[PDB]
């Protein structure tokens, strides 16, 4: 019939056993308050949905990010609310500080804690092997946490790791994909950063969960420690699993797919090709080998897999020997 069904190896049933007031965003009453009380600085950016500003509040002249929401469904703007009040104060998690409204425009506006960030295209090359593994350990917590309060980011890249070298802080940020996990739920496979996509969205199998952003972590660490950004680089969906295909092969492919009962696109027959299993080690040379080691290639190779139950949960790879230095 159709596909066989998953479930999360960590954290299943977390939002089973709570109240609906928890999950449930669409009852979720937003109540926005005063912009007034912040004056806008300069601006940060622009997302998708979005407009970012740095400001400072003329209550205490603490510095802020404000995030201006262009118009957009209420009920993704209730989740992304919800989830960032469930999260509030977890480790390496963007504070939500306030919820306003221009009193004229009527713009509604999520206001955030401000991070000092250094663009991660400046700031990537310069990190030696015991940032790499400081910065994957901090991101790993944000997580763990996260995964544990029963929510899937679903949009892991640099772009959303705001890092403040100096003072080494790190802030996971814009959970606007993000969403709650409940064992059986078939999502929307259209989340996530296409070279950060894993394969799951990318043949199409809805019922993932936590994993995802482990396979994005794992993009995120071999394109660190290879210095190679981004690391998987196809020129759409379809392509980005050429790509994927090209290193992991596509014999542990064609099993995944077998396994999980995966209809796959007819698109895929004649683009995927035929590809062996590339080591890790193909990826090394003169210019990365410092940032590399055994233990990095082997918690490497435990998230880049095509099988979503098979990467390490959060907690598991807090315990890799690659973090023995860290921690
Ligand atoms: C733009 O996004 C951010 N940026 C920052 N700091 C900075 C970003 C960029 C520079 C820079 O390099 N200059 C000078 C332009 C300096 C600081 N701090 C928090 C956020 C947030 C995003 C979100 C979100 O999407 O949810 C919640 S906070
Ligand atoms: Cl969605």
């Known amino acids: 019939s159709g596909p066989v069904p998953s479930r999360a190896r960590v954290y299943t049933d977390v939002n089973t056993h709570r109240p609906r007031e928890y999950w449930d965003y669409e009852s979720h009453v937003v109540e926005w308050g005063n912009q007034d009380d912040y004056q ?21 002249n603490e510095k802020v990010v404000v995030k201006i929401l262009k118009p957009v469904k209420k009920k993704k703007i209730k989740r992304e609310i919800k989830i960032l009040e469930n999260l509030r104060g977890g480790p390496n998690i963007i504070t939500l500080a306030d919820i306003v409204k221009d009193p004229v425009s009527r713009t509604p506006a999520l206001v955030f804690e401000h991070v000092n960030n250094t663009d991660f295209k400046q700031l990537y090359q310069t990190l030696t092997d015991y940032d790499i593994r400081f910065y994957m350990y901090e991101i790993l917590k944000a997580l763990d946490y996260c995964h544990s309060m029963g929510i899937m980011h679903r949009d892991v890249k640099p772009h959303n790791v705001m890092i403040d070298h100096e003072h080494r802080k790190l802030r996971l940020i814009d959970w606007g994909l993000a969403e709650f996990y409940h064992p059986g739920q078939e999502y929307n496979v259209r989340v996530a950063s296409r070279y950060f996509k894993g394969p799951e969205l990318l043949v199409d199998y809805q019922m993932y969960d936590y994993s995802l952003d482990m396979w994005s972590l794992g993009c995120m660490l071999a394109s660190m420690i290879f210095r190679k950004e981004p690391f998987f680089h196809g020129h759409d969906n379809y392509d980005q699993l050429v790509r994927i295909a090209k290193v992991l092969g596509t014999e542990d492919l064609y099993d995944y797919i077998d396994k999980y009962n995966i209809e796959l696109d007819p698109r895929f027959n004649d683009i995927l090709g035929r590809h062996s299993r590339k080591r890790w080690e193909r990826f090394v040379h003169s210019e990365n080998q410092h940032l590399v080691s055994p233990e990095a290639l082997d918690f490497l190779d435990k998230l880049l897999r095509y099988d979503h139950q098979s990467r390490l949960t959060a907690r598991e790879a807090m315990e890799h020997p690659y973090f023995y230095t860290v921690v």
């Open 40 to 60: 806008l600085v300069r601006k940060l950016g622009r997302g998708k949905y979005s407009e970012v500003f740095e400001a400072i509040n003329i209550t205490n």
